């Protein structure tokens, strides 16, 4: 299959390749694990353009940046390829040189936190230095050119013995958040609210991607030593990224994704937004564009199999008759993640 750069309409079901340094600069953050192994194995970075990423990228070609922030939502079945249709947009709008703020799994902040720190600066809010520092260290390699460019306007107090005052580039505030991990989260939230204040300018086109948005409004697994559960509001991190989807600001576009796999207390088979997000989630999410992401059809399927034949990744001798195609089609119901899992051991 033939392609050049991200945007083409008649190139649906074709293989787009990128460099390794594109992979390192554009996604310093998480890339879906199975796709990361795909890349490390074939040594070529290849994706296939889908109709949902076409529809969404043609809604991000026409954006009017004077208009308030518009919210998009990517929904569908487990392993139907809706986390990567976020990656298409991410690297196309990183190639247009935007500010890419990317959180791979929101639930990671909601679930399984080793260290829960108590903060009364924010009025009874808890922070996760670990996640804050990892996310910041990825945000540093994400966009370098704009971190020397932004000028921070506030007076900021890290410690009784340390302060940074206005006129500072944001590379400095981010690396000062990374270096001292104690206050790293307050640095994250500050990076967020000042990103949103400075997005009014024509210097900032802000693409905000938070996968598993249902984690923001969802029920939390983390608990106090009292054994009492904490709400999604009680974290500094969630409380901050909740102001990042609010659509109060201009110059940006918020691309969102609702998840089952990463979720908590949600059943396995509900792929629809309103259930995952609940009353709080859908109600606070405001009018958004509800994009459906489904499994491959016959052309996308025979294209995926073409892709797996070219790399000789199907090592089964009988995978080369129409029998193999019929059986993998009958086995996966042509689901991309399922077809990945099924061509894993073959």
């Amino acid at each position: 299959x033939x392609x050049x750069x991200x945007x083409x309409x008649x190139x649906x079901x074709x293989x787009x390749x990128x460099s390794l340094q594109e992979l390192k600069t554009v996604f310093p953050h998480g890339l879906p694990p199975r796709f990361a192994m795909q890349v490390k194995t074939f040594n070529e970075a290849c994706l296939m353009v889908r109709k949902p990423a076409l529809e969404l990228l043609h809604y991000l070609k026409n954006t009017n940046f004077a208009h308030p922030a518009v919210r998009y939502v990517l929904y569908g079945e487990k392993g139907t390829g809706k986390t990567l249709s976020l990656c298409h947009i991410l690297h196309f709008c990183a190639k247009q040189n935007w500010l890419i703020l990317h959180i791979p799994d929101a639930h990671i902040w909601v679930k399984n936190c080793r260290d829960l720190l108590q903060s009364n600066y924010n009025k009874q809010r808890f922070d996760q230095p670990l996640e804050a520092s990892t996310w910041l260290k990825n945000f540093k390699t994400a966009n370098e050119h704009f971190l020397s460019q932004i000028k921070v306007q506030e007076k900021y107090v890290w410690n009784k013995r340390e302060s940074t005052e206005k006129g500072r580039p944001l590379g400095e505030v981010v690396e000062q958040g990374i270096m001292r991990v104690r206050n790293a989260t307050d640095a994250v939230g500050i990076v967020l609210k000042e990103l949103k204040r400075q997005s009014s300018l024509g210097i900032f086109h802000l693409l905000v991607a938070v996968d598993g948005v249902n984690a923001l409004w969802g029920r939390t697994t983390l608990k106090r030593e009292d054994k009492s559960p904490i709400a999604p509001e009680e974290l500094a991190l969630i409380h901050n990224l909740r102001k990042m989807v609010k659509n109060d600001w201009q110059g940006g576009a918020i691309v969102l994704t609702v998840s089952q796999t990463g979720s908590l207390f949600k059943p396995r088979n509900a792929y629809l937004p309103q259930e995952l997000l609940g009353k709080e989630g859908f109600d606070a999410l405001d009018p958004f564009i509800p994009i459906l992401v489904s499994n491959y059809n016959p052309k996308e399927f025979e294209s995926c199999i073409q892709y797996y034949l070219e790399n000789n990744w199907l090592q089964h001798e009988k995978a080369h008759t129409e029998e193999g195609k019929k059986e993998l089609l009958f086995l996966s119901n042509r689901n991309p993640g399922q077809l990945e899992r099924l061509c894993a051991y073959l």
Binding site: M37, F42, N312, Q315, H316, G324, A344, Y345, L346
Partner: protein, 208 residues
């Protein structure tokens, strides 16, 4: 055994039935088969006519199962075929064109070549004579030795890996090292053959 002796086994192979017309004694044979009113067994759920099943893979899978989990074993086998496959990719893309002609990226033929090579030729049985147990060299039938190889592989990789080391990784390692004969499995095979030789005289103790 809810079946009487009356119930003959299912022939699950599609290719035998699809192409009947060129064989006389076989037409006669499956005619005598279904004409006799033979009650025929319900075909097993584990076996499928799928072009992707290998009964060798099937039995190594089964032998790896613990408790009632077919799922956990099917998964560990998936991950082992996966580790072997991708690791062979990692050895292929770091190499030179000659070795890009040589290297095997098929985990299936690497598996069959890992068990065909690990299979001990003779094996010992204890015999009681004059109050002593002597280990005597015994010629073995194919299936027993198949079992021998598989069992040795499973036993070793269950046993000798460190606690952080996953099963499919370790089994990929030993599969690949058994392909080239240099893993501890063929060492057990070779100790089997050395002990088979030291005592070979006693083979006159064998009455069968």
């Amino acid at each position: 055994s809810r079946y009487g002796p009356e119930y003959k086994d299912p022939q699950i192979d599609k290719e035998y039935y699809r192409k009947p017309l060129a064989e006389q004694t076989e037409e006669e044979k499956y005619e005598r088969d279904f004409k006799k009113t033979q009650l025929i067994k319900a075909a097993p759920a584990t076996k499928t006519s799928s072009v992707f099943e290998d009964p060798v893979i099937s039995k190594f899978t089964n032998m790896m199962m613990k408790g009632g989990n077919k799922v956990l074993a099917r998964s560990l086998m998936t991950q082992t075929l996966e580790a072997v496959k991708r690791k062979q990719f990692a050895k292929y893309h770091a190499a030179s064109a000659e070795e890009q002609a040589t290297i095997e990226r098929n985990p299936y033929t690497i598996f069959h070549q890992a068990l065909k090579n690990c299979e001990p030729v003779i094996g010992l049985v204890p015999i009681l004579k004059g109050g002593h147990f002597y280990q005597v060299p015994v010629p073995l039938a194919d299936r027993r030795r198949r079992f021998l190889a598989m069992k040795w592989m499973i036993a070793e990789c269950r046993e000798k890996k460190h606690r952080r080391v996953l099963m499919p990784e370790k089994l990929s390692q030993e599969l690949l090292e058994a392909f080239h004969n240099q893993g501890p499995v063929i060492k057990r095979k070779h100790d089997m053959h050395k002990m088979a030789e030291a005592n070979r005289a006693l083979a006159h103790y064998r009455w069968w």
